[PDB]
Design a protein around this ligand. Structure first.
Ligand SMILES: *P(=O)(OC(C)C)OC(C)C
Ligand SMILES: *P(=O)(OC(C)C)OC(C)C
Lengths: 377, 377
């Protein structure tokens, strides 16, 4: 713990002084043992308010593993089935292929991002999704989940279900499925199916306590810029066009629940979900848990470049040398566009979590490689 | 801050190493700015559950400043008056002196602990209070508050109201007064008068969530020992006889609300109350707030030893030199038998709070002195 902590603080120190990072919370656990848990920098720069260990964060796509857990809990109960048509819960969600014909789309297709659906951020302004007014769930729009999914369903699939991999709005679709299966709003279903059983008390989809939050920033000069609603921040090289951010979304009760991007939570609560995934203390049936953590897409998918497939929850490390990383094979990893990154190195019993208020440094920037390297040095 | 954090952490590190402390949460604020907010050690040693900044604690006499604020909000509202007889709300509460006379007992006498009332703990086994079966509010008994106050009123007062100082069940009497004055149970009344206006979201009288709590231990060698209901633990020299602990009391709905010992809360919520006392942003009328923080008893009362009197909320430091402390005159201070200590050094704008699960080290032990000294180093 002592040497690791020195390496990590060195990383963070440099990052803060070089104005690459406003503030972060990072946790390292090994076989359920906390080796590092620290707040870094500021939560609200303008107010001079320091980051705290239990500061709340908008999770963006760190939401996906939590909502995927909810879907799997319903599968374990027999209320969903991996091979069932999505139309059993969403009768009008019938996207068509480019030739006009309608394929079968299963719950499995959606969890693995192999259904053919996409995201606005893939190509941005003037794209199909753009013309159709489809929301990625990070911006604030005046319509509900049903209306976004109607719009989504009117777009052509990128390929036939099961024949490709593409990151997508599938978890926003699965959010609606969960609501229909449970007969509850998505916030309540997630609470019942995942957060309460795991002891996650500080997470949800809408908050009324802005003073507890990490204020979002995006990369800039000569210092990170404080986000305001409506802004379009371009994605790096090989990560997509852009993202349209609304920091106020988390506080608006009329923001539809986005299963792919819409939750908030503390670092401790996210760690509780990652640990349940890592260690499966009777949270899911053993065969279903193993399937969810196994690559279900293929290395050909290159979901975060070469050597990575995809399971039901995240990318899955297939080839460490091809991916250029010290992580061991079997590692689980994903992130979030507000500036977060996490991985579970299953062989080492390692859960590593980084939540930040700086998009995109904490998602894909040098910060993330430097911290990962520090953990394995 | 970085400096203060290192000095404070070294004190905790040694306390933990020597096994004089299982776990704690401490906070130092200066003129409204959080300088230090840290969890240390374990909440539940046997389960290996670490302390968290939001861990809940049984507050013991840290209840008193919060219930006293409830009383003072009623006074400001005109529903109580400092000068009024307790009998205007508790007609049958008529303690007598050792001659037979029924003296005047006012709200002022209770708030200051100058009424003549006492505690079982002052004498313990075999005493008058023992013979009458009077409870200090920390153990679990099969009767309600009205029954405990009937027993209490049957004991003779120790001295004439206003003629001396003696730590007492007076805040438990005042809890009953608040119930009569508001027509609500004490928990609901405190919630309305104090916790809601001050944003104290994680406090109360009865909890259904044991997994959130710090488990109570008592001092011991080689290590502190986990308490069970009904055990008796002698108090430190010059502190009284003993305390009978019932850790399950906070989870039992049938436990009467004790205004002097009965609440639970988090460190943050306690800090909100202490800050309200310290800076009074329109929470109470200025003259009443000043009266409450002013010595109403005199240095002679030696309430924390020589140099200390008492106001309406706590001890008040009159003479630092006599008290052998670096704290400034005017300092407010009190504690709790589950292992807690707090003070407000008004001159320095300082609020300092220690909540622990180790009776009595976190209340009166070397730990409290070493922490105090590091703050002022
Ligand atoms: P998420 O935060 O994406 C949202 C914009 C839906 O994940 C990143 C890796 C694209
Ligand atoms: P409180 O926690 O105690 C009575 C309820 C017995 O503490 C005082 C003695 C400071």
């Amino acid at each position: 713990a002592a040497s690791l902590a020195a390496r990590l603080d060195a990383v963070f120190d440099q990052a803060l002084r070089e104005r690459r990072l406003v503030g972060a919370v990072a946790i390292v656990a090994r076989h359920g043992e906390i080796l590092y848990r620290r707040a870094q920098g500021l939560a609200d720069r303008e107010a001079g308010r320091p980051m705290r260990e239990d500061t709340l964060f908008r999770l963006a796509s760190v939401t996906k593993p939590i909502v995927a857990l909810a879907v799997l809990r319903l599968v374990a109960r027999g209320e969903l089935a991996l091979d069932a048509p999505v139309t059993r819960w969403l009768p009008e969600f019938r996207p068509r292929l480019a030739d006009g014909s309608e394929p079968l789309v299963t719950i499995h297709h959606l969890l693995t991002h192999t259904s053919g659906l996409g995201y606005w951020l893939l190509e941005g302004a003037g794209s199909v999704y753009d013309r159709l007014g489809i929301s990625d769930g990070i911006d604030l729009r005046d319509f509900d989940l049903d209306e976004n999914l109607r719009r989504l369903a009117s777009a052509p699939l990128s390929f036939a279900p099961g024949s490709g991999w593409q990151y997508s709005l599938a978890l926003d679709v699965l959010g609606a499925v969960v609501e229909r299966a449970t007969g509850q709003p998505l916030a309540a279903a997630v609470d019942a199916l995942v957060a309460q059983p795991l002891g996650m008390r500080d997470c949800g989809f809408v908050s009324a306590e802005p003073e507890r939050f990490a204020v979002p920033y995006h990369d800039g000069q000569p210092e990170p810029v404080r986000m305001r609603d409506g802004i379009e921040v371009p994605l790096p090289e090989g990560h997509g066009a852009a993202v349209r951010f609304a920091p106020s979304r988390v506080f608006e009760p009329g923001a539809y629940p986005s299963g792919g991007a819409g939750m908030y939570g503390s670092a401790d609560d996210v760690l509780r979900a990652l640990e349940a995934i890592r260690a499966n203390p009777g949270f899911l049936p053993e065969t279903l848990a193993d399937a969810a953590r196994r690559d279900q897409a293929g290395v050909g998918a290159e979901t975060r470049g070469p050597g990575w497939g995809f399971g039901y929850l995240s990318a899955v490390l297939d080839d460490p040398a091809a991916a250029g990383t010290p992580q061991h094979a079997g590692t689980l990893q994903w992130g979030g566009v507000y500036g977060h990154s996490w991985f579970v190195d299953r062989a080492l019993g390692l859960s590593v979590l980084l939540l930040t208020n700086t998009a995109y440094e904490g998602m894909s920037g040098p910060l993330t490689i430097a911290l990962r390297d520090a953990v394995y040095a």
